[PDB]
Structures are given as C-alpha cells and as structure tokens.
C-alpha cells in the first residue's frame, strides 16, 4: 500500500486581511482538492491539546445507565426525536465504536426550526453536569471554535474556485447551520470482536467501509493512530496521521455544485486495535441553503446541474450512508 500526498497547509492567512496571502493558501487548497482531495490545515489556532483526553474520559466515565438515557432512536425506542443527536452505543462482542453526536447549540425549544419540527433539526441532549463537570461547556465552545476554523477554510475554498471569499461562508451561519460534531471512541479490545471487523474487496480489514462524506467539507481532528485511506485510480493510499492538524476534505455537496471539479474523495477506515479518539466536524449549511452549481472547467462556467437545497441533501445523505455502511 502506497501513501497519499496530503500537504500541510498553513491556513492562518485565511483569518487575516492579506488578500494575496489568502490567494496563495487558496492555490494550495485547489491543488490538494484536485489531487487526493485531502490536506492538513496547520497553524489553525484551535487548542487541540485536551480534545483527546476529554473525549476519552467522557466515553470511559459515562455509564450504561447514562448511555441509555442519552441514546439516539436507533438504540432507544423512547427517543423518537433523537435521530442525529445523542449517544451511539457500542455492542460488546459485535460493535466496537461508540460515539456522541451533537448539533448547533442554538437549536433550543425556542428556535424557529425546532418549533416548526423541521427534519434534521434537534435539541441537543447532554449528560448530568455533576457526573460530567464542564463537559457541555467544553463541547459547545468546541463547536464554535471549529465553526470559526471552518468559516475561514470556506473562504479558502471559495477563492480557490474563483469566487469571492464569502461564496460558501455566507450560507454558513451560527443561527441555522446543520453542522455536527461527533466525539468517537475507537477502543482497544482483546480479543477484538470479529463481527466488528469488515473485510474489503482487496482484503484490507476495516472498521468503516468506503464512502463519500455527507457534507460541504469535513474538518477532522484525530488521535495519532494511522487509519484512514483515500481511494485513487491506483488504489487505496494510506493517509498519515497528524495529531496537531485538522484533516480537511470535500463532501458530496461540494462535488455536486462544482460539477465534480472538486470530487468528494472516497475513503475508508482501517481496523487498528488501538485506543483512539476521532472528532469530525461536518460542515453543513442551513436547511434552505442553495448554492447554484457551476463548472470551473468551462470558459463560461455554466453547469446544467440542478441547485440542491441543503436540508433535503442532508436528509437523503444521512439515511443513504446508514443503509450502505450500517448504523453507527
Ligand atoms: C473518519 C470519521 C469521519 C469517522 N466516520 C464518520 O464520521 C462517518 C463517515 S464520514 N460519518 C457518519 O457516519 C455520518 C455522521 C453524521 C452525524 N450523525 C450527523 O447527524 O451529522 C470515523 O472515524 O469512522
Ligand atoms: C489525543 C490528543 O489530543 N493529543 C494531542 C495532540 C498534540 C497537539 C500533539 N498534543 O501533544 C497532544 C496532547 C499529544
Ligand atoms: Fe468520511
């Protein structure tokens, strides 16, 4: 197995006002997006030093009682409103991964989309503050920290595609973003349950099968344990780990609106028997957000593709991925 070219891009100019410097970042984003589709954002300003400990302590200190109490509808029939947000339980002997997903903190009972009962909007559920001191505060602040990084990155992607820097970010708003954080624990297990290991067509043992992301972009922090592979014409290539940077790639919403100029890279998760933490942030727009497609390869930039409303895209995408690659 070969190794993917995944450049480390200093994204700090995207927070500044040096426009030429922003363009030089955008060129690097362009080149990565046209190559394997992945790059590492470095010099990003987020304090990642404790992200792994908090995630691990939360998952290791939360009890079975609390997991049922926070469980999404797939694990608890009593929680019909928790489709996206809540705890995703492991199944000892069968399923190793466990996670906790939360959405926009501004989705409260008073929010208009919650009052309208619009799909994909949910009020977050949280554990008991006394049993998990500071956890909710940490998690909500992290949401906005990675929101800010994602906003800057979206300015880089817009410039990379020849647009003004707010072409994407203008649709990415704290009041309505459908973006999500998932705090994933991949455990060390001995023996490791065979049922939790899938064998790819090429024989590689996997924890999660090939897929394109349901997102505009995906902004991921992970522990320093190599596991991701990206598919190229020459086969799957290993993505090296970097527990200081954020791994960035496009989702299928970006591929659609660019007439596949920036593809949504197909990737998968190798099985590795090692305790590790994964914290993806799925950059989703608002429910009614629509971006007019275009084709940067054509002189006139025109695309025949239908503009897709983001909320319908997300509803269709999250169900499709569950069907192909299983309930997580
Ligand atoms: C590599 C990571 C992204 C992670 N995989 C994942 O997060 C996988 C594939 S991108 N993602 C999903 O299943 C979609 C989660 C959507 C979330 N509940 C939401 O409602 O918004 C892994 O480490 O397995
Ligand atoms: C799991 C984790 O958060 N590790 C971080 C990553 C980094 C920035 C390299 N730090 O050194 C830690 C604490 C090892
Ligand atoms: Fe993915």
Author numbering: 4 to 331
Question: How does the study describe this entry?
Answer:
IPNS contains a distorted double-stranded β-helix (DSBH) core fold (cupin or “jelly-roll” fold), which is characteristic of the 2OG oxygenase structural superfamily. Recent X-ray free-electron laser studies including time-resolved serial femtosecond crystallography show that binding of O2 to the IPNS–Fe(II)–ACV complex induces unexpected conformational changes in α-helices on the surface of IPNS, in particular in α3 and α10.
To support the proposed association of the 19F NMR and DEER studies with the tr-SFX analysis, we carried out crystallographic analyses on the spin-labeled IPNSS55C–Fe–ACV complex under anaerobic conditions and after exposure of single crystals to NO to give a spin-labeled IPNSS55C–Fe–ACV–NO complex. By contrast with the spin-labeled IPNSS55C–Fe–ACV complex, the structure obtained after NO exposure clearly revealed covalent modification of C55 with a 3-(acetomido)-PROXYL label in crystallo. Analysis of the active site reveals octahedral coordination of the Fe via H214, D216, and H270, the ACV thiolate, and water, as well as substantial, but incomplete, NO binding (80%). Likely, as a result of the incomplete NO binding, two conformations of the substrate ACV were observed. One of these is the same as in the absence of NO in the anaerobic complex (ACV conf A 20%, yellow). In the spin-labeled IPNS–Fe–ACV–NO complex, it appears that α3 is rearranged (>80%) compared with anaerobic IPNS–Fe–ACV. The new conformation is the same as that previously reported to be induced by O2/NO binding to the metal ion. NO binding apparently changes the conformation of the ACV valinyl carboxylate, which induces rearrangement of S281 on β11, in turn causing changes in the conformations of the adjacent residues Q280 and V282 with consequent conformational rearrangement of α3. After NO exposure, however, clear electron density for the spin label was apparent, and it was refined in two conformations. Crystallographic studies on IPNS show that, at least in one case (α3), labeling of S55C does impact neither on the overall fold nor on the conformational changes induced by NO binding.
